[PDB]
Amino acid sequence: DEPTSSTGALTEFVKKMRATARKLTLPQGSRDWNSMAVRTRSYMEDLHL
Amino acid sequence: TQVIVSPNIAAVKQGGQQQFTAYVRATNAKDHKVVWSVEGGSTGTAITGD
Amino acid sequence: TFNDVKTSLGITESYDIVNAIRNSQGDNFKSYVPLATANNVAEVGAGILINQTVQNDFITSLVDRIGLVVIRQVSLNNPLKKFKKGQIPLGRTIEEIYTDITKEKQYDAEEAEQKVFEREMPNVKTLFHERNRQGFYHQTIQDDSLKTAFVSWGNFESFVSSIINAIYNSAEVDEYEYMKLLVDNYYSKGLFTTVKIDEPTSSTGALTEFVKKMRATARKLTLPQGSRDWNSMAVRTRSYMEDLHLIIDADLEAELDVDVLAKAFNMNRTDFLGNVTVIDGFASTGLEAVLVDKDWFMVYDNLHKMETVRNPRGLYWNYYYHVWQTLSVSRFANAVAFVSGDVPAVTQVIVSPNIAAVKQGGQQQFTAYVRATNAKDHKVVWSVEGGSTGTAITGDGLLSVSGNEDNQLTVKATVDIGTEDKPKLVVGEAVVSIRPNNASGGAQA
């Protein structure tokens, strides 16, 4: 939902943020976040929001 | 599962108006309807829709 | 001199504390009941204005003396003097020039064969400031008659010094009111970029919704790429965070102070993010928290001159302290006025460089920059009021004048808001002079 629409929608956006940014930097990686669908891994110092 | 009201703590001037925002936390996206109400107070203190 | 007088002279006296009250009830005024000299303290204990020659209580021929002289001194300083920018001896007008960015073209070697020496004009907007105030502060000190009023030389000098400090305070009082006036001029002329807020005094949510628009606009003003909006000339300009100056009044501070900060474990995250200065004014309606660059003020100086004459026949000096200033506002700096209450849908329609100077048969595109307040509406309606019979603007800003066009034109960018039965328009304007073509003219095939 739009995070500017409320405060309750704002914290909802943060929980979807931090959960996603942890998924990008798991040590086993995933196929779910590229578009070539390869098992890649990000690092926290590389992610730019 | 629950409903979150914006400005959970509000402190409104007499005569003033605070817009409130409901945030329906759900699983199925049915965009559920809200009924607003207010407990305590006068006859003049009455909430409207939205 | 003076004959008799009452003691209460300018006293309106809501209730008589002396006889009508303290002598009357057995109420909370019982703490003042046992006082023996209370009817005297309540009488002249506010100060008196007209001095009598009160006699002495024992030797009635003697008089009572003034035992102390308390000359009280004030020093009045302009809180906005840090925005003052200099002095001009010679000249009247200021030519503030902005150059703006231009548009990219595509690389093509085959076309580059024939367009080496083609020319493309820069995008340069200028604006103009000229001298505004010319005033003086007359003061007269008649030193020799004032020797009758004092006994000490140390009090005589501290009084004649005080009158010299009655001007130089008034030169700071009136300069402050003129620098507030430039703000309310700039809002009345409709030139701030208004961010519509609620009145922060009403609900503390409306206060906290105001801090969010405050910090956002401050972050938006200082984005390194700059932004076209937030100023009245509509150029791409970039503010520095140390150069933003949030000008609130004293009430809006204590809203943030008591409500927001008091209950903030992290103070810097709900901070105003500017160099917050405090006034007690803005005078208009709903206007508060004017967030400006420091280059917004174009206050210059022209004369600070104390000129004296002495009348020798009557023993006095005249003190004419002349102040001449150029009190104006740059529009190339960017300025935001958080106006509560109801504001219009469109505040202004900024148009293209308003000096187009188009040759007969030429074309010129005019770019509208609508300063809408809320979210979206408002297609622009164009117009060629001025000369005609050939002069025709399209739905975009192309002018396409004529071969016969002579008179200057007024290109209008009209935005209709409000009611269809009384259509309130926000009409931005642009001027263009028409120079003759002189080739491919006369008659034509």
Curated annotation (Swiss-Prot), chain A:
Disulfide bonds: none annotated. It is found in: Virion. Homohexamer. Homopentamer. The prolate capsid is composed of pentamers and hexamers of the capsid protein. Belongs to the phi29likevirus major capsid protein family. Assembles to form a prolate capsid shell of about 54 nm in length and 45 nm in width, with a T=3, Q=5 symmetry. This is Major capsid protein. It comes from Bacillus phage phi29 (Bacteriophage phi-29). The gene is 8. The chain holds residues 201 to 249 of 448 of the full protein.
UniProtKB/Swiss-Prot annotation, chain B:
Homohexamer. Homopentamer. The prolate capsid is composed of pentamers and hexamers of the capsid protein. Belongs to the phi29likevirus major capsid protein family. The chain holds residues 350 to 399 of 448 of the full protein. This is Major capsid protein. It is found in: Virion. Assembles to form a prolate capsid shell of about 54 nm in length and 45 nm in width, with a T=3, Q=5 symmetry. It comes from Bacillus phage phi29 (Bacteriophage phi-29). It comes from the Viruses. Residues 1-50 form the BIG2 domain.
